[PDB]
Amino acid sequence: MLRISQEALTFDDVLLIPGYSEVLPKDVSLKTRLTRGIELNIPLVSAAMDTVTEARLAIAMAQEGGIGIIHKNMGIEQQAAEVRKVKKHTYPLASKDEQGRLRVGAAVGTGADTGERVAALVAAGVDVVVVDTAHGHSKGVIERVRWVKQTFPDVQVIGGNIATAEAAKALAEAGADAVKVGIGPGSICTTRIVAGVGVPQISAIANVAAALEGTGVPLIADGGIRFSGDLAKAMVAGAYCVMMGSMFAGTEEAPGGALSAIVHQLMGGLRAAMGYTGSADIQQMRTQPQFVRITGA
Amino acid sequence: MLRISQEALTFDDVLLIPGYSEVLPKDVSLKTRLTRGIELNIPLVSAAMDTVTEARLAIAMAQEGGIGIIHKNMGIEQQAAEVRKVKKHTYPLASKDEQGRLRVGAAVGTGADTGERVAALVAAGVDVVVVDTAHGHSKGVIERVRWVKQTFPDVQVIGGNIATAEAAKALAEAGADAVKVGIGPGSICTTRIVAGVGVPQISAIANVAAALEGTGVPLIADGGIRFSGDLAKAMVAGAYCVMMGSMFAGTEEAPGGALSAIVHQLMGGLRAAMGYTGSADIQQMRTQPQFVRITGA
Amino acid sequence: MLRISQEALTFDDVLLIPGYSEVLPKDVSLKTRLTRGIELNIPLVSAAMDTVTEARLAIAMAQEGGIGIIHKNMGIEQQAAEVRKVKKHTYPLASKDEQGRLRVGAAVGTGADTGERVAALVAAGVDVVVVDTAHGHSKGVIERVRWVKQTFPDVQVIGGNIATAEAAKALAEAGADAVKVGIGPGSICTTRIVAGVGVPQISAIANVAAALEGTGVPLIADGGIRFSGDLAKAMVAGAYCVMMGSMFAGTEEAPGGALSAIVHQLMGGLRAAMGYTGSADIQQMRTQPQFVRITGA
Amino acid sequence: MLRISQEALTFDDVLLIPGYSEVLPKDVSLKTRLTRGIELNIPLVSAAMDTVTEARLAIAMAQEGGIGIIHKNMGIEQQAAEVRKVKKHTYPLASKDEQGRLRVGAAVGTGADTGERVAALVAAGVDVVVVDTAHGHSKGVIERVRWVKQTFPDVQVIGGNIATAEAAKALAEAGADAVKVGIGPGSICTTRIVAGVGVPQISAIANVAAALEGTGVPLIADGGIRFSGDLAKAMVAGAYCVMMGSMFAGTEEAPGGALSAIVHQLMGGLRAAMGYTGSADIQQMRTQPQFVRITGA
Ligand SMILES: O=c1[nH]cnc2c1ncn2[C@@H]1O[C@H](COP(=O)(O)O)[C@@H](O)[C@H]1O
Ligand SMILES: O=c1[nH]cnc2c1ncn2[C@@H]1O[C@H](COP(=O)(O)O)[C@@H](O)[C@H]1O
Ligand SMILES: O=c1[nH]cnc2c1ncn2[C@@H]1O[C@H](COP(=O)(O)O)[C@@H](O)[C@H]1O
Ligand SMILES: O=c1[nH]cnc2c1ncn2[C@@H]1O[C@H](COP(=O)(O)O)[C@@H](O)[C@H]1O
Ligand SMILES: [Mg+2]
Ligand SMILES: [Mg+2]
Ligand SMILES: [Mg+2]
Ligand SMILES: [Mg+2]
Ligand SMILES: [Mg+2]
Ligand SMILES: [Mg+2]
Ligand SMILES: [Mg+2]
Ligand SMILES: [Mg+2]
């Protein structure tokens, strides 16, 4: 009578099966979407962590073809200033808005300052507001996502974090332009030890991807990626892109080597996986390849 | 032809799935029952171990809104004296009887001294007698539970330890006001190594909770809890409250830091779990949230 | 298309479920059978290993109520002499033949000396001949078992080692008075590493016990027992008794503390298990209690 | 909605079940095929690695009754010269062509030099060309296999590496005389860590063997074998022979003890497994014995 919904799988539970391939790793397309309205040339997002993303690293992420989410452990005036630095800043893949400015995102919470914070970020020219808490399937987050969409209809909004189909549907209904997936996997996050709560990330991604199929709402896989192999698996489970934190934290660009080298490795691995599965682009990678389930052995 | 009843799960086999939430962790209700007749403001009980509960720690447990079970590795006269110390002793959550005295429990076994021991404890004003052995699904325990209920009808009686539906039904039929669950999990208890006997505690709790549904008989989860996360899982599997031993053993109040700090952490974690699952009170937490099963990976 | 017969379980895969109990550990019966014709007061046999059983330890085993199998890494004349020492040697449980002599067994192989070896052992008064090789489901062993039964009908004969129902039936048909179970589990035996061959011992025991049900042919569980808990599980899976090697190897009685202390511990644990399962005797222990299957966690 | 094809098993997931046996290990036949046209007296192939197979070790492998595949991390002229050394070189089991010359194979890739490389190797008298890449289920490999078969019909050709039924069928259709199985298991190969790609080798072998049943196309198990036990399991899963790399790398014969000692051990273990399963020859070993699946425990 124990209420078990399903067996749920993490990265180490699965491997990608090779499939017939004609397109070499160097030739596949990595283009994807962050949100309904924002495209990325690589499926990489940097985390809204105070050890990872401020203006310097967000500029670098945008130049690489991804995007950075400025963390919110700072005052409103400073966070707006971080956004302005990016917006005012050869990188052929660079993520840019219609005015040719580098794209940037910024995190907000649900606390008392949120309305004022969102307004300041929008005024600073932020491309996307990320309503970002430990539990996105909540009145607080869902209300705030709807408020941002209704109040600032010209900005993109992301809600998270979630790990279920029901949560995905709730955020989509609130007007989210993308959802962020990950409850438990944050490299350690002591969510499992302290609250006993979590959903293994491969299942979490797949369940959200299935819920959002046909909606046009992207999903971002946030947490638990240690190697480029995990990144490839996240994509095949259905993620549109992956958010990384601690792997970027030691870099020259992160707050007190080069980020470019880590990005190159990560995308090298993803390209290798696409070659193995015969996936010519991200849409194929998300929808066609298969996994095998493996044992502890 | 190997006689396997089921696959049985322990704490590390499962995680709680987040659900829609509106009530913040700080605002949920932790009120529950220890027995048919005894309510607790927090779902915490201290173990009847000689390294854990004598009068000092039992007083502290009652003040925190839980209860202590005085251990029985002492003479009858001393155990009665321990009970009197608690009964004769701002704590707004304090567990108190109808006379405004702090509640306390006391353990007895099945040996020759039991009748005299029970009589002395009852005379000392004990709120609940815990008939407490390694194997509660036994003639000795079931007979003693019935005897206490028939002889001292105004005292509460707990029987344990058990790990099966059949055992739960047997104790309920004997007149138990609550049952205590745990064969194997006692942090090590060498029951598994020496006798090869045990039932993984999440399954044990769920099986007992199902057997007792609609009876009004609470069940206490005893053993194996290392982190607040385990406590949350125990509740969702169906426990009314949790008994802890070794985690309290190092405290200022335990027999030769403060117990309050550990209680605060444990309840903090439970509150976090209730927030994640959208459980506003313990009755909801016990009956509504779901688990995912996870692999070793 | 991989040819997998079943999932097979070892000791650590299972735990015994407690059942209603009235008979205390100190009061249960440990009496069992080694073979069709030989009874034992405890379900313990010492291994035919040159670090475990020569006359000294076999005498001690018989006195304890079990039996020793003299190893065969010695000349025929010495092995007969070892047997004579036991046969010619307060121990109320002692295993004795109809003449009041301590019982003893002796191992033989399938090599050229076997006929002469068996004849010498029988002449020396051996109670049971153990035809003992790494692979008992073989022409060599099955032929030798039939030969011993036809040539020396008044001696008991054991064949092994086996791990399948088919093998059990083959030895029973050859006239074996008991079969010995264990391919792989010998504490390390590098059978799994070198040949990739083995059957997890709990499944091996259960499969053999099912094959032999109603035949009157006992089965001996040989190998892999590290703790008294494993011994209890072996019995509930269907073993009539257990053979131990390395656990006895360090003892005062084994070839270059007391064996009695280890026997006392092992039987103490088995008694505890019988108490937990409510098994009053070995026949009940073999046939009534249930297991739960558990995870790595 | 996670796209999982199957649960897939590796060596440590399974054990061989003993079966009725009459043929001793020393008496079983180890004869098998490398390709449609090439027979081997033992089922052993050395890897095309620059730490494993050049002329010296390939000569030794052929003398032992197996074959070596000369690695391709060298110029065309040197690789042809390596082949000539073997072709121009008591060993009763020696692998020889119709002219009495030791057999040898050589690896090629898919790069620009392949046509010229293949021509030079064929002119040098190579017995088999191995079109050898990380992903054999690819346009590059399948095209090259067909080209070699159509251009040099008198040479044997192997394609690999693959891990699926579909891939096996594709190579067979291209004209491959054998396929090589292994994506992931190469002792570490960081294919799993970097690309997240792989198929546990026991399942990979069985799936390919099933696809090729009745075609006359052999399959070679390449990678992941640490012990002779793994070798036996690979055969029973359906491999015709096994390719080994790192285990040979430290030997006197490998590029900067004796290879013979390692071969003797490996075949000793395989012989032991055939004895346990009652397999008199390789065809029996491949098709008749069964596995049990085992747990982490
Ligand atoms: O201080 C924190 N608060 C909340 N979430 C965090 C914090 N640090 C890391 N995380 C989570 O963990 C993710 C990073 O995971 P990582 O790539 O494994 O380091 C973030 O994007 C967040 O979702
Ligand atoms: O000395 C003992 N005898 C019997 N049970 C014990 C003893 N010590 C601990 N336990 C059990 O283990 C539980 C404590 O588990 P813990 O919270 O993991 O330390 C107790 O409530 C008892 O059920
Ligand atoms: O040298 C040996 N040859 C064959 N079998 C052995 C040898 N040593 C131990 N065994 C096996 O392993 C069993 C002992 O297992 P143990 O109680 O785990 O030490 C023996 O009864 C034998 O079945
Ligand atoms: O440098 C390499 N490139 C490609 N494959 C390799 C390399 N080294 C080892 N392998 C693979 O790993 C196999 C050897 O596996 P091993 O017997 O476990 O050492 C080779 O036959 C190859 O399939
Ligand atoms: Mg900073
Ligand atoms: Mg700073
Ligand atoms: Mg004391
Ligand atoms: Mg004291
Ligand atoms: Mg000796
Ligand atoms: Mg000696
Ligand atoms: Mg070289
Ligand atoms: Mg060299």
PDB file of N, CA, C and O in Angstrom, chain B residues 246-291:
ATOM      1  N   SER B 246      19.884   6.820  19.010  1.00  0.00           N
ATOM      2  CA  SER B 246      21.292   7.197  18.982  1.00  0.00           C
ATOM      3  C   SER B 246      21.521   8.658  18.591  1.00  0.00           C
ATOM      4  O   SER B 246      22.506   9.262  19.014  1.00  0.00           O
ATOM      5  N   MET B 247      20.612   9.242  17.816  1.00  0.00           N
ATOM      6  CA  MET B 247      20.773  10.637  17.443  1.00  0.00           C
ATOM      7  C   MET B 247      20.662  11.571  18.641  1.00  0.00           C
ATOM      8  O   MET B 247      21.205  12.683  18.626  1.00  0.00           O
ATOM      9  N   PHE B 248      19.968  11.119  19.682  1.00  0.00           N
ATOM     10  CA  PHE B 248      19.808  11.926  20.885  1.00  0.00           C
ATOM     11  C   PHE B 248      20.869  11.607  21.940  1.00  0.00           C
ATOM     12  O   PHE B 248      21.000  12.330  22.926  1.00  0.00           O
ATOM     13  N   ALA B 249      21.610  10.522  21.741  1.00  0.00           N
ATOM     14  CA  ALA B 249      22.467   9.967  22.791  1.00  0.00           C
ATOM     15  C   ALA B 249      23.604  10.892  23.233  1.00  0.00           C
ATOM     16  O   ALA B 249      24.065  10.819  24.374  1.00  0.00           O
ATOM     17  N   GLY B 250      24.062  11.761  22.343  1.00  0.00           N
ATOM     18  CA  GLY B 250      25.195  12.606  22.686  1.00  0.00           C
ATOM     19  C   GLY B 250      24.831  13.910  23.371  1.00  0.00           C
ATOM     20  O   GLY B 250      25.710  14.701  23.717  1.00  0.00           O
ATOM     21  N   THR B 251      23.538  14.140  23.574  1.00  0.00           N
ATOM     22  CA  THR B 251      23.060  15.456  23.988  1.00  0.00           C
ATOM     23  C   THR B 251      23.282  15.745  25.466  1.00  0.00           C
ATOM     24  O   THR B 251      23.493  14.832  26.269  1.00  0.00           O
ATOM     25  N   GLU B 252      23.226  17.029  25.811  1.00  0.00           N
ATOM     26  CA  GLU B 252      23.379  17.478  27.194  1.00  0.00           C
ATOM     27  C   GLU B 252      22.367  16.805  28.117  1.00  0.00           C
ATOM     28  O   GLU B 252      22.682  16.477  29.265  1.00  0.00           O
ATOM     29  N   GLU B 253      21.161  16.579  27.601  1.00  0.00           N
ATOM     30  CA  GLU B 253      20.071  16.023  28.393  1.00  0.00           C
ATOM     31  C   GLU B 253      20.125  14.498  28.541  1.00  0.00           C
ATOM     32  O   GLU B 253      19.536  13.953  29.471  1.00  0.00           O
ATOM     33  N   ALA B 254      20.809  13.821  27.625  1.00  0.00           N
ATOM     34  CA  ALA B 254      20.872  12.358  27.647  1.00  0.00           C
ATOM     35  C   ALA B 254      21.728  11.873  28.818  1.00  0.00           C
ATOM     36  O   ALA B 254      22.577  12.618  29.303  1.00  0.00           O
ATOM     37  N   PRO B 255      21.523  10.621  29.263  1.00  0.00           N
ATOM     38  CA  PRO B 255      22.366  10.113  30.356  1.00  0.00           C
ATOM     39  C   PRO B 255      23.859  10.164  30.045  1.00  0.00           C
ATOM     40  O   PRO B 255      24.270  10.037  28.890  1.00  0.00           O
ATOM     41  N   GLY B 256      24.668  10.352  31.080  1.00  0.00           N
ATOM     42  CA  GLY B 256      26.104  10.213  30.934  1.00  0.00           C
ATOM     43  C   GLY B 256      26.463   8.752  30.741  1.00  0.00           C
ATOM     44  O   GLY B 256      27.415   8.413  30.037  1.00  0.00           O
ATOM     45  N   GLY B 257      25.386  18.925  21.849  1.00  0.00           N
ATOM     46  CA  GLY B 257      24.831  20.092  22.506  1.00  0.00           C
ATOM     47  C   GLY B 257      23.440  19.847  23.054  1.00  0.00           C
ATOM     48  O   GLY B 257      23.125  18.746  23.518  1.00  0.00           O
ATOM     49  N   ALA B 258      22.600  20.876  22.998  1.00  0.00           N
ATOM     50  CA  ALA B 258      21.247  20.784  23.532  1.00  0.00           C
ATOM     51  C   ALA B 258      20.338  19.966  22.620  1.00  0.00           C
ATOM     52  O   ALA B 258      20.430  20.055  21.394  1.00  0.00           O
ATOM     53  N   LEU B 259      19.463  19.174  23.235  1.00  0.00           N
ATOM     54  CA  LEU B 259      18.459  18.402  22.502  1.00  0.00           C
ATOM     55  C   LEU B 259      17.626  19.309  21.599  1.00  0.00           C
ATOM     56  O   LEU B 259      17.326  18.951  20.454  1.00  0.00           O
ATOM     57  N   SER B 260      17.267  20.488  22.115  1.00  0.00           N
ATOM     58  CA  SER B 260      16.463  21.460  21.363  1.00  0.00           C
ATOM     59  C   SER B 260      16.988  21.726  19.948  1.00  0.00           C
ATOM     60  O   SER B 260      16.201  21.901  19.025  1.00  0.00           O
ATOM     61  N   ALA B 261      18.305  21.750  19.769  1.00  0.00           N
ATOM     62  CA  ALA B 261      18.880  22.072  18.460  1.00  0.00           C
ATOM     63  C   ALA B 261      18.646  20.946  17.455  1.00  0.00           C
ATOM     64  O   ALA B 261      18.418  21.188  16.264  1.00  0.00           O
ATOM     65  N   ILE B 262      18.712  19.715  17.938  1.00  0.00           N
ATOM     66  CA  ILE B 262      18.511  18.549  17.097  1.00  0.00           C
ATOM     67  C   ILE B 262      17.030  18.442  16.735  1.00  0.00           C
ATOM     68  O   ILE B 262      16.685  18.168  15.575  1.00  0.00           O
ATOM     69  N   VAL B 263      16.163  18.669  17.718  1.00  0.00           N
ATOM     70  CA  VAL B 263      14.721  18.687  17.466  1.00  0.00           C
ATOM     71  C   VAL B 263      14.390  19.757  16.430  1.00  0.00           C
ATOM     72  O   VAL B 263      13.607  19.522  15.493  1.00  0.00           O
ATOM     73  N   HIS B 264      14.989  20.934  16.586  1.00  0.00           N
ATOM     74  CA  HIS B 264      14.708  22.027  15.655  1.00  0.00           C
ATOM     75  C   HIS B 264      15.096  21.646  14.224  1.00  0.00           C
ATOM     76  O   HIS B 264      14.365  21.956  13.277  1.00  0.00           O
ATOM     77  N   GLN B 265      16.231  20.970  14.069  1.00  0.00           N
ATOM     78  CA  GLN B 265      16.704  20.556  12.749  1.00  0.00           C
ATOM     79  C   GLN B 265      15.777  19.512  12.141  1.00  0.00           C
ATOM     80  O   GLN B 265      15.412  19.600  10.968  1.00  0.00           O
ATOM     81  N   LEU B 266      15.437  18.505  12.942  1.00  0.00           N
ATOM     82  CA  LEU B 266      14.587  17.416  12.489  1.00  0.00           C
ATOM     83  C   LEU B 266      13.237  17.945  12.036  1.00  0.00           C
ATOM     84  O   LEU B 266      12.751  17.591  10.958  1.00  0.00           O
ATOM     85  N   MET B 267      12.627  18.792  12.854  1.00  0.00           N
ATOM     86  CA  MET B 267      11.332  19.349  12.489  1.00  0.00           C
ATOM     87  C   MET B 267      11.441  20.342  11.336  1.00  0.00           C
ATOM     88  O   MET B 267      10.505  20.466  10.543  1.00  0.00           O
ATOM     89  N   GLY B 268      12.573  21.032  11.233  1.00  0.00           N
ATOM     90  CA  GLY B 268      12.832  21.901  10.091  1.00  0.00           C
ATOM     91  C   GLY B 268      12.797  21.127   8.783  1.00  0.00           C
ATOM     92  O   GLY B 268      12.201  21.564   7.784  1.00  0.00           O
ATOM     93  N   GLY B 269      13.441  19.967   8.783  1.00  0.00           N
ATOM     94  CA  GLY B 269      13.463  19.100   7.619  1.00  0.00           C
ATOM     95  C   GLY B 269      12.091  18.548   7.285  1.00  0.00           C
ATOM     96  O   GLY B 269      11.722  18.481   6.105  1.00  0.00           O
ATOM     97  N   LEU B 270      11.336  18.150   8.313  1.00  0.00           N
ATOM     98  CA  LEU B 270       9.985  17.636   8.099  1.00  0.00           C
ATOM     99  C   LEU B 270       9.101  18.742   7.523  1.00  0.00           C
ATOM    100  O   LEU B 270       8.333  18.512   6.580  1.00  0.00           O
ATOM    101  N   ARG B 271       9.216  19.946   8.080  1.00  0.00           N
ATOM    102  CA  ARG B 271       8.469  21.097   7.565  1.00  0.00           C
ATOM    103  C   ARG B 271       8.813  21.358   6.096  1.00  0.00           C
ATOM    104  O   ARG B 271       7.934  21.651   5.281  1.00  0.00           O
ATOM    105  N   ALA B 272      10.092  21.241   5.758  1.00  0.00           N
ATOM    106  CA  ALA B 272      10.515  21.429   4.375  1.00  0.00           C
ATOM    107  C   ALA B 272       9.853  20.387   3.465  1.00  0.00           C
ATOM    108  O   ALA B 272       9.351  20.717   2.387  1.00  0.00           O
ATOM    109  N   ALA B 273       9.850  19.131   3.905  1.00  0.00           N
ATOM    110  CA  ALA B 273       9.208  18.056   3.145  1.00  0.00           C
ATOM    111  C   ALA B 273       7.704  18.275   2.954  1.00  0.00           C
ATOM    112  O   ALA B 273       7.148  17.991   1.885  1.00  0.00           O
ATOM    113  N   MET B 274       7.043  18.774   3.993  1.00  0.00           N
ATOM    114  CA  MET B 274       5.615  19.033   3.917  1.00  0.00           C
ATOM    115  C   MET B 274       5.358  20.167   2.935  1.00  0.00           C
ATOM    116  O   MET B 274       4.400  20.114   2.163  1.00  0.00           O
ATOM    117  N   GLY B 275       6.244  21.155   2.931  1.00  0.00           N
ATOM    118  CA  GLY B 275       6.174  22.234   1.952  1.00  0.00           C
ATOM    119  C   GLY B 275       6.330  21.730   0.524  1.00  0.00           C
ATOM    120  O   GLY B 275       5.569  22.112  -0.361  1.00  0.00           O
ATOM    121  N   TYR B 276       7.297  20.852   0.304  1.00  0.00           N
ATOM    122  CA  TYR B 276       7.535  20.280  -1.017  1.00  0.00           C
ATOM    123  C   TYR B 276       6.361  19.443  -1.507  1.00  0.00           C
ATOM    124  O   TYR B 276       6.080  19.430  -2.694  1.00  0.00           O
ATOM    125  N   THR B 277       5.704  18.727  -0.603  1.00  0.00           N
ATOM    126  CA  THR B 277       4.627  17.822  -1.006  1.00  0.00           C
ATOM    127  C   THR B 277       3.270  18.500  -0.960  1.00  0.00           C
ATOM    128  O   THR B 277       2.267  17.917  -1.369  1.00  0.00           O
ATOM    129  N   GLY B 278       3.240  19.728  -0.463  1.00  0.00           N
ATOM    130  CA  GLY B 278       1.993  20.458  -0.318  1.00  0.00           C
ATOM    131  C   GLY B 278       1.106  19.865   0.767  1.00  0.00           C
ATOM    132  O   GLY B 278      -0.127  19.884   0.671  1.00  0.00           O
ATOM    133  N   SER B 279       1.733  19.334   1.811  1.00  0.00           N
ATOM    134  CA  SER B 279       0.990  18.757   2.938  1.00  0.00           C
ATOM    135  C   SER B 279       0.865  19.781   4.047  1.00  0.00           C
ATOM    136  O   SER B 279       1.863  20.207   4.598  1.00  0.00           O
ATOM    137  N   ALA B 280      -0.373  20.169   4.371  1.00  0.00           N
ATOM    138  CA  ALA B 280      -0.637  21.227   5.343  1.00  0.00           C
ATOM    139  C   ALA B 280      -0.607  20.749   6.791  1.00  0.00           C
ATOM    140  O   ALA B 280      -0.461  21.557   7.723  1.00  0.00           O
ATOM    141  N   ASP B 281      -0.771  19.442   6.978  1.00  0.00           N
ATOM    142  CA  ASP B 281      -0.777  18.851   8.310  1.00  0.00           C
ATOM    143  C   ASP B 281      -0.330  17.399   8.233  1.00  0.00           C
ATOM    144  O   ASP B 281      -0.086  16.869   7.142  1.00  0.00           O
ATOM    145  N   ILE B 282      -0.211  16.754   9.389  1.00  0.00           N
ATOM    146  CA  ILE B 282       0.335  15.400   9.417  1.00  0.00           C
ATOM    147  C   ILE B 282      -0.600  14.393   8.769  1.00  0.00           C
ATOM    148  O   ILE B 282      -0.157  13.441   8.111  1.00  0.00           O
ATOM    149  N   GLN B 283      -1.904  14.590   8.940  1.00  0.00           N
ATOM    150  CA  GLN B 283      -2.849  13.660   8.335  1.00  0.00           C
ATOM    151  C   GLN B 283      -2.680  13.648   6.813  1.00  0.00           C
ATOM    152  O   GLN B 283      -2.664  12.571   6.216  1.00  0.00           O
ATOM    153  N   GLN B 284      -2.524  14.820   6.205  1.00  0.00           N
ATOM    154  CA  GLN B 284      -2.239  14.937   4.768  1.00  0.00           C
ATOM    155  C   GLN B 284      -0.894  14.282   4.423  1.00  0.00           C
ATOM    156  O   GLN B 284      -0.773  13.536   3.449  1.00  0.00           O
ATOM    157  N   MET B 285       0.126  14.577   5.223  1.00  0.00           N
ATOM    158  CA  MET B 285       1.467  14.039   4.960  1.00  0.00           C
ATOM    159  C   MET B 285       1.486  12.506   4.952  1.00  0.00           C
ATOM    160  O   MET B 285       2.210  11.894   4.171  1.00  0.00           O
ATOM    161  N   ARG B 286       0.682  11.901   5.824  1.00  0.00           N
ATOM    162  CA  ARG B 286       0.619  10.446   5.967  1.00  0.00           C
ATOM    163  C   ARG B 286      -0.087   9.750   4.816  1.00  0.00           C
ATOM    164  O   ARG B 286       0.131   8.566   4.568  1.00  0.00           O
ATOM    165  N   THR B 287      -0.979  10.468   4.154  1.00  0.00           N
ATOM    166  CA  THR B 287      -1.947   9.809   3.289  1.00  0.00           C
ATOM    167  C   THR B 287      -1.943  10.253   1.829  1.00  0.00           C
ATOM    168  O   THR B 287      -2.453   9.531   0.972  1.00  0.00           O
ATOM    169  N   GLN B 288      -1.366  11.413   1.523  1.00  0.00           N
ATOM    170  CA  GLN B 288      -1.477  11.945   0.166  1.00  0.00           C
ATOM    171  C   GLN B 288      -0.205  11.905  -0.707  1.00  0.00           C
ATOM    172  O   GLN B 288      -0.291  11.571  -1.892  1.00  0.00           O
ATOM    173  N   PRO B 289       0.966  12.278  -0.156  1.00  0.00           N
ATOM    174  CA  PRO B 289       2.124  12.334  -1.062  1.00  0.00           C
ATOM    175  C   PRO B 289       2.562  10.969  -1.585  1.00  0.00           C
ATOM    176  O   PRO B 289       2.256   9.937  -0.990  1.00  0.00           O
ATOM    177  N   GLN B 290       3.273  10.995  -2.710  1.00  0.00           N
ATOM    178  CA  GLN B 290       3.784   9.798  -3.361  1.00  0.00           C
ATOM    179  C   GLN B 290       5.298   9.723  -3.327  1.00  0.00           C
ATOM    180  O   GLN B 290       5.981  10.742  -3.245  1.00  0.00           O
ATOM    181  N   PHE B 291       5.804   8.500  -3.443  1.00  0.00           N
ATOM    182  CA  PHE B 291       7.226   8.233  -3.590  1.00  0.00           C
ATOM    183  C   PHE B 291       7.594   7.917  -5.035  1.00  0.00           C
ATOM    184  O   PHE B 291       6.759   7.411  -5.775  1.00  0.00           O
TER     185      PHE B 291
END
